[PDB]
């Protein structure tokens, strides 16, 4: 049982490892929204220009 329960833990950490692996890119994209929101909130853009930001 001790040998088996360790392998259950061995793949137990594997499940958490893959779950965080997907959340890595999820964090990246919301940052890409963050930088674009800084550009969009300016006072020099037109509706044609700001909608191209909305496209992405």
């Amino acid at each position: 049982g001790l040998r088996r329960a360790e392998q259950n833990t061995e793949d137990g950490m594997s499940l958490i490892q893959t779950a965080e692996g997907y959340l890595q890119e999820t964090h990246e994209i919301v940052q890409r929204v963050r930088v674009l929101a800084v550009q969009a909130a300016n006072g020099i853009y037109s509706e044609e220009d700001r909608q191209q930001i909305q496209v992405e």
Binding site: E10, D11, S14, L15, Q17, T18, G21, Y22, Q24, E25
Partner: protein, 53 residues
């Protein structure tokens, strides 16, 4: 996708691939027991030859 491919591939090998450090110990455990019974086997072949007197 590459990051997710890495994580599942790492998760995959931990189930399929064997550990050389762990398995070589158990492999030698049986190889020793193989020689002990084989060596002691000739004792039994000579065990009952002594009552021939």
């Amino acid at each position: 996708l590459m990051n997710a491919y890495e994580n599942t591939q790492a998760s995959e090998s931990r189930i399929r691939d064997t550990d050389m450090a762990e398995q070589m110990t158990s492999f030698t455990r049986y190889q020793i027991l193989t020689q002990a019974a084989t060596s002691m086997l000739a004792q039994a072949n000579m065990k009952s030859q002594s009552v021939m007197r």
